[PDB]
Each structure stands twice: as C-alpha cells, then as structure tokens.
Subunit: 115 residues, 4 copies
C-alpha cells in the first residue's frame, strides 16, 4: 500500500505580504524551501494559527534571505500580514519506506528567524 | 519506492465565471481551448480558487465547446462562485522528485472577455 | 505524470438518514455503488446542493434496493434528511490512459430513482 | 497503468481529545498503542472529523508515549478541536482496484477514558 507522509514543514512563520492582485500562490524565501525540502510549484497546505483557516495552494520561490512569506491571489482572503502559519508538503511512498521516513522540519520565531 | 511529489500541472489564471447553475449535476465546464492551454483533461480533478470571494473548492473539469469561452460552475459549486467572479482553476499531477525538480506547469493568464494571453 | 480523474459519481441523490451516533461514513444502496463503481471503504467527496457544504468521507454499503443515502457520524453536521447531494470518487492513472478515461455516472430524480 | 483507488487504511473512532494547544507546531500526537491498532504511522497524513462540532480538517500524526492515551491537537488545529471533543481520526492509502475490492481497514473503537475496544 502507498502512504501519504509529511515531506516537510515550516512551523510558525509569519506572513509578510498578502495581495489579491499578485500571483495566486505562496512565495517563500528559497532558504526556507531548502530547509523544508519544499519545491517550486509543489502543492502545499497552509494552516493559519492566528485565524484557524486551513487551505491548499502551491509554493513559489522568493528571494533568498528576504525572509518573505507572501500569500497572494485568492489566498489573500485567508491570511493577513502578521498572521502565524504552518506550511506543509506531503509525498507518497510504499509502506516499507514510510515506516522509517523522516520529514524536513524547520521551526521559526520572531521575524522569520529559523532556529 | 521513490518518493512521489504532488505538483501544479497547469492553471487558468483569472478566468471569469460565465454561467452558474445549482440545478446541474456537479462539474465545471471549460472551453476546450482553455483546457488545452493548461493541459487539463476532461474528467480531471481540479481546484477552483475564487479571487472575488475567497472560497476554495475542488471539483472536476468537463469540456465546453471550443471557442465558447465558457466557464460554467455546475451543481453544488454554484454556492461557491457566481457569474462575474474571477477564479483560478488548477490541476495537480504526481511524479517522482527528480522530475518534479525541473517540472514546468502549463499556465494561461486571462483578461477581458476570457481572452487568453 | 499521474493524473487524478473522476472514477464515478451519484448525481443529485437525496439524503435519507443522518445521525451523529451511527458510524462515521456515508452508507449507500449497493445498487448505487455498483452503478458508479464506488467501493466499500473508498474515499468519497460529498457536495451538498442544498446547503453548499463540501466534505470528504468514505463509503459503506447499505442494503440493495433500500435507496438509502445515510450520512452519519461527524458528517451528520454537514447534511440533513432531504438534502440533495452529489457523491464522487476519484482514481489516479498515467496520463496516456487518463486521456481516454470514462467515469461511471448515475443520475437521480425523485425518491432516489436512478434514471 | 492500472487505476489506483484511495481507501480507508484505518481509523480511531470516537476518541476524545485530551490536549489542545495553539502555541504548538502543527500535528496531532496520538498514543503509540492507538497508532498500532489503526495501522497509522508516525508522520502519516490523517483526517480528523469532529463529531462534537462538525469541523473537518487534515493534519499529520506523531506518536505520544505508549499507554498515555493522549490525543493532542497541536498548532492551528486547536482552533478546530477542544479538550473533551469526540473525534474520528482516519488515514487513507492508495492501491490498485483488485486489492481495494477485498481491502479491510484497521478499525479501533473507543469509549470512556480513551479505552479501546
């Protein structure tokens, strides 16, 4: 059987930009994508700690070192600047491999400072 | 045993809904030209993200007549989108990680009378 | 690439039972499952025409010929007796096969009479 | 090229939430004994369907100490479930159609102090 497993997550990042008129996606500092193994154009779930909303979109890269988390397009109705969110991606694989699978998790505090 | 990613296959960005009818059967009918541009297939699962009202839902695509420029929200989804709403329609496909790392989605942007750029 | 395709659907059935205390699933006349290719224990989406709610659960069989659609457990908060719903399942397959794939669709009217 | 079904792998039915904390990091911690009974793995995607309030959400499982009988909703999901709420926790797996047609999910039912039957 094939399992769906957490690939990676960015835990408790803060939204830095949110505009309806910008591209419909979530733009993320490439350093953050690197740490969590999340890819350009990959499906992601965003879970909003501040307002409780949960939604799925896809990731794109923002400039390395910018510490940007930009929720744009329709998704701007689901998060505001300052909101604390968790961004996750999932992969599938057979059960035998899933049993020892290790996700890529990065934790954040303050102004999107990775700890 | 390779790890499989879920990746954006294609999207119709900022198309406008042209028809919505609660009495219909559960689907989104889309001009076949638009399906071609975005690489979306008849009967394929799609997500619809409504830029006008923020609603997000999943359904599936069916073809409308080539050149009709139709975006018709059929069935229960007519509770989530109205004529005139600006939406993003996306499909996702799965593939191994190496392929995902160089994958290019099919993207079509719209303006005006559902005119593609 | 692997596509997600509509496997089958029951279009515009009416909920006949909805109880929080019964099993958390949707019980469906086996005749209906047969027509739509939907399996016992398969993931299904339910799209509620009456109230607009959309949710995912799994299918179980109800007695053949009963014409039952029973939304139970937590899902009873999302549909009421008399509500009109669309029940769908999805499968994956490679692109080459998906291009000619045909779903199993049954349409309903009146008192869950299949047309 | 065979058609692949999404099937209920396992479920923890009517377990009670024992802890909920918004300040945590995004997961649901579950007594390892419960994970074993339902065939759910650490880091596996799960759905949670809240019988008490009707909310439905997806997250992932992490193990709590064997015998702790913990169901802890961590992070944003604490907006969707509170201590005392009765929930169903499910995981889904994919497999070919023939296997799906005879598949048996791992099911554990609960009562009282998160006592398994």
């Amino acid at each position: 059987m094939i399992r769906t497993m957490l690939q990676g997550k960015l835990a408790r990042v803060k939204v830095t930009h949110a505009d309806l008129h910008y591209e419909g996606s979530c733009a993320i500092d490439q350093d953050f994508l690197d740490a969590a193994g999340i890819l350009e154009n990959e499906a992601i779930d965003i879970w909003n700690v501040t307002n409780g909303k949960r939604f799925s979109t896809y990731a794109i890269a923002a400039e390395r070192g910018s510490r940007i988390i930009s929720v744009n397009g329709a998704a701007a109705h689901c998060a505001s600047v300052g909101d604390i969110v968790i961004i996750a991606s999932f992969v599938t694989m057979p059960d035998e491999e899933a049993r020892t699978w290790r996700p890529n998790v990065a934790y954040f505090e303050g102004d999107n400072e990775m700890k």
